Design a protein around this ligand. Structure first.
Ligand SMILES: *[C@@H]1O[C@H](CO)[C@@H](O[C@@H]2O[C@H](CO)[C@@H](O[C@@H]3O[C@H](CO)[C@@H](O)[C@H](O)[C@@H]3O)[C@H](O)[C@H]2NC(C)=O)[C@H](O)[C@H]1NC(C)=O
Ligand SMILES: *[C@@H]1O[C@H](CO)[C@@H](O[C@@H]2O[C@H](CO)[C@@H](O)[C@H](O)[C@H]2NC(C)=O)[C@H](O)[C@H]1NC(C)=O
Ligand SMILES: *[C@@H]1O[C@H](CO)[C@@H](O)[C@H](O)[C@H]1NC(C)=O
Ligand SMILES: *[C@@H]1O[C@H](CO)[C@@H](O)[C@H](O)[C@H]1NC(C)=O
Ligand SMILES: *[C@@H]1O[C@H](CO)[C@@H](O)[C@H](O)[C@H]1NC(C)=O
Ligand SMILES: *[C@@H]1O[C@H](CO)[C@@H](O)[C@H](O)[C@H]1NC(C)=O
Ligand SMILES: *[C@@H]1O[C@H](CO)[C@@H](O)[C@H](O)[C@H]1NC(C)=O
Lengths: 48, 109, 81, 174, 174, 174
């Protein structure tokens, strides 16, 4: 294959700014944070 | 589908004079920061062998007389000097995306 | 006759977190985290890496007779051992 | 909901409102339906999109772990390197989680004000002409056409003319 | 107080209110006293308790200093270790202080909205029936029993019936 | 502007107001001009100045880079020192930028509430006597002197006396 970023456990196809695969990454690709879930809310809270 | 046009069709240089071979591409064969065009040489009655890979780097075992430079759509290969053990047919190959295509060949007289 | 004020509503069940309460549902949620990988190990920017199968830097540089496939190796992106 | 616009006054969302985020529901003689005002939802879109980029833009500079190796006779340095690398990751994963947690609260509260202020200006325009029911509903007096609803929608509500017919309607019910 | 509920409209707290956080004071023919509404103070308790746990839960992962020793001939490494260990503590003590400082402001402002919105719904229910004095007091017209006070307390205030007696009381004072 | 006081109700600032931050404009028989109330602008000055010092006071303890040198045979340690020093600077420059970014929003929102609450108390004092135009203007009924404007300015507005003349003015226009 051919990936812009490579990690010891595989490789990343994305443009997101975060990942939690491995810290020792090579290439220009998202940074590493040890979190399970990171979401940004872009809408109203819905009663339904 | 890059189509490779290589000129001159037949090159003739005596011993010791620079020999310039060139070929052009339809769109740019440069991606990811490095131009992906490889130079091949096929001696008569022999299988082709790699001379220049990625249009700049030279394979080990190939004498330093072979020089390749280029950028964008045009690439050139120069040989300094030229002796009797240089007659062959040279091809330039692109690998930006499949299918791979070859040049029309060039006899070196 | 009547006129009132209102806001967009949706039937989506996207879950977002906040400090006051961990579970709140919103109409539109954007996730920024990559947890999936292809699982392979291929080249970076078109140049194949130097994949040392069994011998290591000491073995390859010294020329271990077990691995003679790593002599005259071309340009690489990274070394895998 | 600190401002109280979400729930509070208006506790029920509109599933039929897909054109935009904030809008008005009109129920008059010339039918009924949902309509949107662009000046409110466009600023929310621009503000939220700027916030989303800001999280990415600010997080551009971060610690990048690199591999270092030691020869089994220098373990104090290896422990020092190991504690430094994961220590920086622990610091940076806290900043990312705290930033996401706080900005989630901002967006929900930012949306509260926009719909709250949208209600405030409609009350401030209608004033004595309409009555406040409690769920965001306004019941005005004049028997005008649907264009008056659009007049409320472009925020151009001229008061005087409509006052006389409404004050004739404030004296017939009293 | 950004929302202005604390001080502002109501600048005097109730020392006799120990049952809960937010409540109503009734002064009618059937005596007087203080009473509480559970739906407001319970959400504040749950929200604050969740915040208190969140500070503890988020701070679970932190740098832990460990002892390393050197042999008086390697002082660059010892200085590197010393500056790294106290540097991480300086970073983490700033996050803890900043988090505490900001969340203190949140709780005070969160309490402002709850009592402010509690006032808003009572005004929104009573409306024309009562008059707004300025210190949060409402003086309604109808001569109903203490159950009507409880009706205000369960947020179930039916308007129409009470309107006729009140409008007979809006015309006798005018 | 979450509270909506800036823009919203009052979208035009006063360039002639240089005495203070928040004030009242009076247009009566005894001329016209701008005047200030100290109790509102003084608290804003004290609050903002405390915030400005707090940024400086909290940032007193920070990482301080120091020079260390190595002998070209120990590059793992030199790389470790280089990544540690600039890593701490990257962490601290994010805290400073994030703190400045958030506190800028606080000051703008803090100023929103002060002018909003300043409007709220004037409406709460005038009440039925004046009419709400929409741009923060109040048009009262009684034909009193400029001292009544000062009475509004010291927050001491006695209601009863002014009610009778105003209610005689609520019945002549009706
Ligand atoms: C992963 O890397 C690829 C490049 O190898 C990125 O390009 C995306 O590749 C996919 C697969 O071919 C494209 O999907 C295709 O879209 C066309 C319409 O343009 C559709 O006709 C095909 O049937 C197929 O679905 C995709 O368009 C292309 N671009 C994007 C923006 O996705 C890909 O973005 C990388 N990421 C992912 C998550 O795939
Ligand atoms: C809030 O959301 C979290 C995340 O989904 C919920 O946690 C899940 O709960 C279910 C039900 O027991 C489990 O099967 C999942 O494994 C949980 N996932 C995670 C990531 O913890 C949680 O239940 C929701 N509600 C509350 C009150 O926290
Ligand atoms: C090849 O020639 C180019 C210019 O024609 C020059 O820039 C380059 O240094 C030469 N390469 C080698 C290996 O001599
Ligand atoms: C949302 O999904 C539910 C799922 O049952 C459906 O009943 C409802 O009609 C949907 N609403 C809209 C607006 O599509
Ligand atoms: C919408 O509001 C603008 C405000 O200037 C006004 O020019 C326009 O006439 C309004 N639309 C209609 C249909 O009146
Ligand atoms: C309290 O409010 C609830 C709301 O449904 C109502 O059922 C109940 O009757 C109220 N209490 C009394 C004493 O009326
Ligand atoms: C200003 O307000 C204070 C409030 O106690 C009052 O004592 C004073 O008389 C007021 N100023 C004037 C000129 O009345």
């Amino acid at each position: 294959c051919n990936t812009k970023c490579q990690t010891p456990m595989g490789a990343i196809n994305s443009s997101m700014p975060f990942h939690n695969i491995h810290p020792l990454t090579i290439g220009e690709c998202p940074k590493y944070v040890k979190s399970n879930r990171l979401v940004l809310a872009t809408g109203l809270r819905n009663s339904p | 589908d890059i189509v490779l046009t290589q000129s001159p069709g037949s090159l003739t240089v005596s011993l010791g004079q620079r020999a310039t071979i060139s070929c052009r591409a339809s769109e740019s064969v440069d991606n990811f920061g490095k131009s992906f065009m490889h130079w091949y040489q096929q001696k008569p009655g022999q299988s082709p062998k790699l001379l220049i890979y990625r249009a700049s780097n030279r394979e080990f075992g190939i004498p330093a007389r072979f020089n390749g430079s280029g950028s964008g759509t045009d690439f050139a290969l120069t040989i300094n000097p030229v002796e009797a053990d240089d007659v062959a047919t040279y091809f330039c190959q692109q690998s930006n995306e499949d299918p791979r295509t070859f040049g029309g060949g060039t006899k070196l007289e | 006759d009547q006129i009132c004020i209102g806001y967009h509503a949706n039937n989506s069940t996207e879950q977002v977190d906040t400090i006051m309460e961990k579970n709140v549902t919103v109409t539109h949620a954007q996730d920024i985290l990559e947890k999936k990988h292809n699982g392979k190990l291929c080249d970076l920017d078109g140049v194949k890496p130097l994949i040392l199968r069994d011998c290591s830097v000491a073995g390859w540089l010294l020329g271990n007779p077990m691995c003679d496939e790593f002599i005259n190796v071309p340009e690489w992106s990274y070394i895998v051992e | 909901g600190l401002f109280g616009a979400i729930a509070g006054f208006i506790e029920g969302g509109w599933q039929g409102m897909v054109d935009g985020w904030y809008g008005y529901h009109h129920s008059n003689e010339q039918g009924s339906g949902y309509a949107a005002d662009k000046e409110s939802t466009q600023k929310a879109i621009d503000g939220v999109t700027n916030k989303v980029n800001s999280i990415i833009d600010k997080m551009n500079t971060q610690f990048e772990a690199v591999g270092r190796e030691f020869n089994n006779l220098e373990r104090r340095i290896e422990n020092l390197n190991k504690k430094m690398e994961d220590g920086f990751l622990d610091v940076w994963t806290y900043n990312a989680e705290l930033l996401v947690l706080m900005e989630n609260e901002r967006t929900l509260d930012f949306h509260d004000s926009n719909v709250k202020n949208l209600y405030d200006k409609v009350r401030l325009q209608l004033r004595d002409n309409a009555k406040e029911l409690g769920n965001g509903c306004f019941e005005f007096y004049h028997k005008c056409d649907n264009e008056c609803m659009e007049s409320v929608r472009n925020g151009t509500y001229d008061y005087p003319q409509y006052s006389e017919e409404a004050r004739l309607k404030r004296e017939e019910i009293s």
